[PDB]
């Protein structure tokens, strides 16, 4: 038929009660599953949400049981991290004609950037020439922008890589895709494998290779699964590597900004920090060095979620601030300001939130006597400002701003990263009665700016901000069980997530769900044969511009009615979410 081939890889909708036994669930990639821990997340109160997402993040560190998917601590994973640390070494010995690229779209690309700076600092600090760089879907503007459409081109990924790979002679390309999903990455990896004598591809994600994407990429002939299958074969001869531990599903299904983002830093900082630290020692990096690092990162989680109660509250002040239709501000210094920006940008696509609903500031990059003049005026009784900084920062730069924001705002609150027994100047910092002090042990540090202390803090902030931003919106009633139904379809992956969600909630056939989705997307145009057979980017591009696409499609299905009828029905309910919930009853 027309469209049959575009949709060929979609498994049919199981008959009720047979979701398990048709083998459908076993086909859903780990990264997209519903985490059972979060089945009733739309009901958790602020303190549970914090617990539940604390539990989900912990799974990053959970070990392998006895037939089952390998994990962060399995010896096949750590061995591979050893081998890779190793290849990063060769390059560090030959900094002339040498380069190391970290690449991904979306948050994988953000993570890539963060880590390229750090590992560039570290080499600067020893007056070694910088070898790291990053690549993000849609260039550097993407690092601080919501730009979900940019990941779909394999040729774009190959372009951006051909740029930075110059006339260099040894290139390590660490391609990052939580889902083993992004076409951007796929093309980089396939390119690398064509020119081994220069390129070393290393692929980082969190699905087994047999769950890697196998739907066709519009500008490329092989799929992600093929590329990854072939990289795995090459690993036997140490010419490619696949680093792909399971870490369990995301608390909000498919939200790979969360665990996926964290596991990415954890996995790669670990392995890179080891690479360097063991070079000047003139010793092979070993599982033992990595493990120290990993266990530090696993302490970091326990440390970080010690502050759960105060985390829950900061979430409550954010929820109400956004219920009351206010705005929310995150202000922070050095890399923690960045991480702030990042969390706020992600709320746009992740929740259909406006770019002011939760905004991030660095000292986006709006300075002391700047933020005070421009942003400060328009704050309000109902708003919330959040301060994120270490005590090794300019605390006089800090207090000024809090002195000032105590004017319009009262719901402030802060996130203070001390190394133990640093005190916190002004005991009149009962500006924040119950701050979020997170205090870090003393450690042994050789390298420059105590990089492990950076990674810990960064990671803990990400955990905090993410849990908080995600937490706020669930509380608002905006999530359905642990799914975001009402997403904006802005790339092919989200198109598939939409379709899958229509099948899950309607229980109706694949062909009906596809029909309702394409009708909803293209309304008022009807299903022509061209539209049915069009490449998925055609639907993406049109859907990207609409509102309530997925709920209208689900409604069409549940009432077994038309798009005109479901739109009118929706317009008649108090809100999207009641329309949907009601219709499920
Ligand atoms: O090819 S994909 O783009 C892909 C991306 C990454 C690796 S492969 N596509 C695979 C299937 N997929 C999905 C999503 C949700 C469900 C759900 O059934 C429900 F729709 F309900 F969300 C579940 F989460 F509940 F399990 C099922 C399947 C989304 C993405
Ligand atoms: O790392 P992947 O699977 O290639 O995902 C790449 C991006 O889609 C992903 O980071 C996305 O932008 C975030 O919205 C996830 O909440």
From Swiss-Prot:
Query: Where, per UniProt, does this protein localize?
Result: Cytoplasm; Nucleus; Mitochondrion
Which GO biological process annotations does it have?
carbohydrate derivative metabolic process; intracellular glucose homeostasis; negative regulation of glucokinase activity; protein import into nucleus; protein localization to nucleus; response to fructose; response to glucose; triglyceride homeostasis
Region Important for interaction with GCK, annotated ranges: 197-198
Q: Which PROSITE patterns match?
A: GCKR, SIS
List each copy of the SIS domain by range.
88-284, 318-478
What residue range is the signal peptide?
none
Q: In which tissues is it expressed?
A: Found in liver and pancreas. Not detected in muscle, brain, heart, thymus, intestine, uterus, adipose tissue, kidney, adrenal, lung or spleen.
- Keyword Repeat present in the record's keywords: the answer is yes
Tell me yes or no: is Nucleus among this UniProt entry's keywords.
yes
Q: Where does beta-D-fructose 1-phosphate bind?
A: 107-108, 151, 177-179, 346, 493
Q: Which keywords accompany this UniProt record?
A: Carbohydrate metabolism, Cytoplasm, Mitochondrion, Nucleus, Repeat
- Which segments carry the region annotation Essential for interaction with GCK? 442-444
Q: Which Pfam families match?
A: GKRP-like_C, GKRP_SIS_2, GKRP_SIS_N
The main place the protein resides is: cytoplasm
* Record-listed beta-D-fructose 6-phosphate binding positions: 107-108, 177-179, 493
| A GO MF label | glucose sensor activity
One cellular component (GO) term of this entry: cytoplasm
Q: What is known of its domains?
A: Fructose 1-phosphate and fructose 6-phosphate compete for the same binding site.
**UniProt record similarity statement:** Belongs to the GCKR family.
Summarize the subunit comment: Interacts (fructose 6-phosphate bound form) with GCK.
According to its UniProt entry, the function of this protein is described as: Regulates glucokinase (GCK) by forming an inactive complex with this enzyme. Acts by promoting GCK recruitment to the nucleus, possibly to provide a reserve of GCK that can be quickly released in the cytoplasm after a meal. The affinity of GCKR for GCK is modulated by fructose metabolites: GCKR with bound fructose 6-phosphate has increased affinity for GCK, while GCKR with bound fructose 1-phosphate has strongly decreased affinity for GCK and does not inhibit GCK activity.
Name listed for the protein in its UniProt record: Glucokinase regulatory protein
Origin organism is: Homo sapiens (Human)
Question: Which gene name belongs to this protein?
Answer: GCKR
């Amino acid at each position: 038929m027309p469209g049959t081939k575009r949709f060929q890889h979609v498994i049919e909708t199981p008959e009720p009660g047979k979701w398990e036994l048709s083998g459908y669930e076993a086909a859903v990639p780990i990264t997209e599953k519903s985490n059972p821990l979060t089945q009733d997340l739309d009901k958790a109160d602020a303190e549970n949400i914090v617990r539940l997402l604390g539990q989900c993040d912990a799974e990053i560190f959970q070990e392998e049981g006895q037939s089952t998917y390998q994990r962060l601590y399995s010896e096949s994973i750590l061995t591979t991290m050893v081998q890779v640390a190793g290849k990063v070494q060769e390059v560090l010995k030959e900094p002339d004609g040498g380069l190391v690229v970290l690449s991904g779209g979306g948050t994988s690309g953000r993570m890539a950037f963060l880590m390229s700076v750090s590992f560039n600092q570290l080499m600067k600090g020893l007056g070694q020439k910088p070898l790291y760089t990053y690549l993000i879907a849609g260039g550097d503007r993407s690092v601080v922008a919501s730009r979900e459409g940019t990941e779909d081109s394999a040729l774009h990924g190959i372009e951006e890589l051909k740029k930075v790979a110059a006339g260099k002679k040894r290139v390590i390309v660490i391609g990052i895709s939580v889902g083993l999903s992004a076409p951007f990455v796929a093309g980089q990896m396939d390119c690398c494998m064509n020119n081994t004598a220069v390129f070393l591809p290393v692929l980082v994600g969190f699905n087994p290779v047999s769950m890697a994407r196998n739907d066709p990429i519009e500008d490329w002939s092989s799929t992600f699964r093929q590329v990854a299958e072939r990289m795995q074969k090459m690993q036997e001869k140490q010419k490619a590597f696949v680093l792909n531990p399971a870490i369990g599903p995301e608390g909000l299904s498919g939200s790979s900004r969360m665990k996926g983002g964290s596991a990415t830093k954890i996995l790669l900082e670990t392995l890179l920090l080891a690479a360097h630290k063991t070079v000047d020692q003139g010793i092979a990096a070993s599982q033992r060095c990595l493990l120290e690092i990993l266990r530090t990162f696993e302490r970091a989680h326990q440390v970080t979620y010690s502050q759960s109660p105060k985390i829950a509250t900061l979430m409550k002040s954010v929820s109400t601030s956004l219920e009351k239709k206010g705005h929310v501000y995150l202000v922070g210094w050095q890399t923690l300001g960045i991480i702030a920006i990042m969390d706020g940008v992600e709320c746009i696509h992740t929740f259909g939130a406006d770019f002011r609903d939760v905004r991030g500031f660095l000292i986006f990059t709006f300075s002391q006597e700047d933020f005070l003049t421009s942003i400060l005026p328009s704050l309000t009784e109902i708003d919330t400002v959040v301060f994120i900084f270490t005590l090794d920062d300019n605390l006089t730069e800090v207090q000024t701003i809090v002195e000032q924001v105590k004017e319009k705002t009262n719901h402030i609150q802060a996130l203070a990263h001390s190394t133990v027994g640093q005190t916190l100047p002004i005991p009149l910092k009962k500006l924040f009665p119950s701050i979020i002090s997170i205090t870090w042990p003393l450690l042994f540090f050789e390298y420059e700016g105590n990089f492990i202390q950076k990674f810990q803090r960064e990671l803990s902030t990400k955990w905090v901000l993410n849990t908080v931003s995600t937490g706020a919106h669930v509380l608002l009633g905006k999530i359905l069980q642990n799914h975001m139904l009402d997403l904006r379809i802005s790339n092919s992956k989200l198109f598939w997530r939409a379709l899958a969600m229509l099948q899950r909630f309607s229980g109706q056939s694949k062909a009906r769900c596809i029909e309702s989705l394409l009708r909803a997307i293209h309304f008022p145009q009807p299903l022509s044969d061209d539209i049915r057979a069009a490449p998925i980017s055609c639907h993406v591009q049109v859907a990207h511009e609409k509102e309530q696409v997925i709920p209208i499609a689900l409604l069409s299905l549940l009432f077994r009615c038309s798009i005109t009828e479901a739109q009118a029905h929706l317009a008649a309910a108090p809100s999207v979410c009641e329309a949907v919930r009601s219709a499920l009853a």
